[PDB]
Amino acid sequence: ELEVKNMDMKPGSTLKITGSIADGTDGFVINLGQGTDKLNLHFNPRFSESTIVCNSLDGSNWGQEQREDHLCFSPGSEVKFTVTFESDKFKVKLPDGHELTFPNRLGHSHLSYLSVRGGFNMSSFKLKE
């Protein structure tokens, strides 16, 4: 579902995201970038594969995935994420507290697009630098 167009996320901006993971779901997708053609951060936790997949979309080109094990969070309840945005790296605070790092391959310096996909009902959203 949710789509957020035309937000102003500059380098150093800290994004706060909170919602409920649907019960009995494969996974969900949080996307940060310029649009659906240019995705700087492809955040895709997968309970089925017990991994968190991070990638980038540039037009019709997907970059190479990076997979993170921890997969601590489970479906059925409220979960908070925190995406810190630097023009070289993305930092992602997890529910437990551990952090994830993914390189900004698109070399951009401004994030405008947020879209939640899969089994995740976003309830709140906060943008602070």
Add this chain to the structure above:
Amino acid sequence: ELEVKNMDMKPGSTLKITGSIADGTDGFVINLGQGTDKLNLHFNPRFSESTIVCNSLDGSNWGQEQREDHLCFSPGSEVKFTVTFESDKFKVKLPDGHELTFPNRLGHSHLSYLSVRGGFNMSSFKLKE
């Protein structure tokens, strides 16, 4: 201009908005509805005209305006609005504390569209239900 598409706001749910009013701006617009041609709530504080004009949009037809004279919030600071959605009316809480009631001309069940226009930089977005 800011847009939030593909959300699911049902009657009884509360929408709270925190942002920053731009310094030296005429006013700003909050659009609640189901599209760009479907505005159930047109929330438009006008600092110049010193009135908050409320209206509905039905495709190519604006409804009839409802003007309020309780602008008690000023440009250049963090400000908060709360829009509770009911099947008959919208109840908008103002930062000072005043509640404004505006009828739901369009009816319907489903609120899917939010967009902020003018000199207003929404920093936070939260849904409760």
